[PDB]
Amino acid sequence: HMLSDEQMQIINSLVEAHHKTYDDSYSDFVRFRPPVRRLSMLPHLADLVSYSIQKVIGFAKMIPGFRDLTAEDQIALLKSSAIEIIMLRSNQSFSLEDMSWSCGGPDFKYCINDVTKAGHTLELLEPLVKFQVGLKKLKLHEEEHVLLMAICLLSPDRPGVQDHVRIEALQDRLCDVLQAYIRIQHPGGRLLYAKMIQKLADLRSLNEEHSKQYRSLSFQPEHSMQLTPLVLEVFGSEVS
Amino acid sequence: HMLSDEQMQIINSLVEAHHKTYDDSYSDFVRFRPPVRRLSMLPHLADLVSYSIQKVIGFAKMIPGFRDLTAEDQIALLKSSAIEIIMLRSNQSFSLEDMSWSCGGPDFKYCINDVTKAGHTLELLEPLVKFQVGLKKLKLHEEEHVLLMAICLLSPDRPGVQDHVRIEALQDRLCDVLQAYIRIQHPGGRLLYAKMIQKLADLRSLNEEHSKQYRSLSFQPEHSMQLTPLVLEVFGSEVS
């Protein structure tokens, strides 16, 4: 009926890691190639994502344990899960008012129609937005959102991982933190942990569908040339 | 004392190819990542160059003969000479007033100090600007500038070319055009052809020095990640 020290440390270090790698003002967006409304929105969103991957790496490096994984396991987890952490962290910009990610005025406000113009069909954006509205309804504490991102990153069931026992043991520790945090700190949250676990399985299904459509994109040089070197590294399939 | 038809055709098709691939208003620059004044200017200029490579390819494809070279010879000539055609085509934006490429207001006006902030030392920018002021002094006709770009592109003495006899025979035809064009159409231009040929050898020396500094850049992932997929393809060394 109380969290440990090592418990509250994990929350502290994760929560601080998030604050350091997520700007609520979205003030660096002016440095991206501007949005345009073919695939008119591909340049701006490619930069959006690449900037985001840089942040997800910063968060990752401060998850306790992650640093001590092999460089190969870190890459494997980042490559397979980056799109999921991005979908996750974007919930903090998603507006139930608008059904759009509102990172600014009319420019950095992202309709579903914008992401079509980056080469994504509704068979992805439809469940993407259901995921987002569901995740928003859960009204997560910062402590939970941050923990959900870390648990998603430390999944052992990802292609290429080599030390699946050490990884799973890290994921386990974090799940124990979220269960305990909710038990003690979140009133009325007796079904929450289980709903949060459900959000992960939705992410895998988003991940899959997104990986399909990225491939179709990445195979067309006129479209892949609009991507960044980091995006092709992380979403590409070089393998180690 | 008169140009041929096939002569004047070569000039016509080259001159039109240039008009189609060079905007004197520099109005697409707003789509680049903005300039910033480490290497603060690397993102904007990387996009400048990548946009430019796209144009140099468009010009190239309309040089008579080029289309019929093998895909491998086209790539070899583009990869080895792209930086030279860019240095060449930039003369049309270079201002003797300012010693800068003035593509716009204070943003797209490029001091030598801007290009330092993209990771280039003076051992390159110094002769680069001497080249530019010299080339500007030559007060080239559109017909000559366009021909000089084509002759530079069709050099047989570039790494990777396979049909150096067919290429050289194309370069020869174009030199004959420039010699004749100047003979007939450019008054007082009896030393011009030879000065233009001199500008090519300066380009090789720029090319070399630039290739050195690009390598140092391209070998640092934090800097190469700011480049575009087209830039790394063209300036990289994949070889066929």
Binding site: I57, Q74, I75 | -
Partner: peptide
């Protein structure tokens, strides 16, 4: 070969 990831990591 994840040259950038390694660097970033």
């Amino acid at each position: 070969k994840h040259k950038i990831l390694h660097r970033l990591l």
